[PDB]
Symmetry: D2
């Protein structure tokens, strides 16, 4: 159910393929920030979820560098997939920028994104 095209509240696009071994691979296109075009993403997910009523834990990373731009930063999203008629991935994320050692204290942003599956 994870595999497919998803969009978040900002208009960003997340295209992912879930592998049988727990691997997530795909491309991400961000509606905001210092980004252009597609960026490679790689992640992991729990391929043997609990079967009560719980979500599937997962996470993925994107380094903001492709052939067109490099923002010297990486974002990791951690959250869970909640399947159903209306599938959603609720996340919390951390965006770290490469900084000198003096600005290190302000290298990391934190937010939350909710993704909606197309079709």
């Amino acid at each position: 159910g994870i595999t497919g095209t998803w969009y978040n509240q900002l208009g960003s696009t997340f295209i992912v393929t879930a592998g049988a071994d727990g691997a997530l691979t795909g491309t991400y296109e961000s509606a905001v920030g210092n980004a252009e075009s597609r960026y490679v993403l790689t992640g992991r997910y729990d391929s043997a979820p609990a079967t009560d009523g719980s979500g599937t834990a997962l996470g993925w990373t994107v380094a903001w560098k492709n052939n067109y731009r490099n923002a010297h930063s990486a974002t990791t999203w951690s959250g869970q997939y909640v399947g159903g008629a209306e599938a959603r991935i609720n996340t919390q994320w951390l965006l770290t920028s490469g900084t000198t050692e003096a600005n290190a204290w302000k290298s990391t942003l934190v937010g939350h994104d909710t993704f909606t599956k197309v079709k």
Copy 2:
């Protein structure tokens, strides 16, 4: 400089290989929590950091399931690599557990880990 064996402050070991295009691949062994043996890890890093003096942005994920246990959770570390004599990777992490909807508010833990090659 990233490629290698790293250890954090809790006793975990992180073995990673950094590929030429920004890929991070390896295995993780946790010292705490519901965990036993190695777990596969994957991530990405800036394979062209700035030349000022800044660290190298990176991140990776470890889903806590292997052929022995499944804690139904995944951790993502976000931080930066800083080279030099005493190379370090400073990160902050988010641990999300699969939960029912009524427990989603307390699904995520947050912490910080410092990795060194010592």
Copy 3:
């Protein structure tokens, strides 16, 4: 505009009074967790906001101990007030529990709450 009664998506209630010196004082009643009745809250807010189109930065803390229960934990909410016809306080929070030194790594939860002002 901050002063008043607010509710979040979980059904929790936040009654606050904003002082002229940047102080926030009031009571909080949580719909979830190890809590019962009212808990004292104290915080600070930027009493001289930018006047472009931006929110007002603020934060407050609640220690989960009152005369009825003690959860040995404290939550701090950090966010901004966005006034208007439909006033909202968008937050991110950290809940830390007192732990032994060995469980310290798992002492802190992180989430996000959106509050809606009544009337």
Copy 4:
């Protein structure tokens, strides 16, 4: 044990008084960021921690505005006090800046600070 003068790893000084019912009052002086002089701080702490061996839960807020500057932001630290010979306060913090709606996604920074009386 909480009452006193504390310092973090960046050079900031935290002067607090802990009241009998759980109130935290004091002043903060930052060593980094847009900041100059002391800022008022208020918080709460568990005024009846458990007797096992656990730390004391606490939190406080500092709005970054005083009679000299206004960074239009507020930081909240959440963590715990651990007594003993080398008393420490370990925390994680969230720094939110007032933003326009189109910049709300990047309104909040997150970090961790360790305070000692040294």
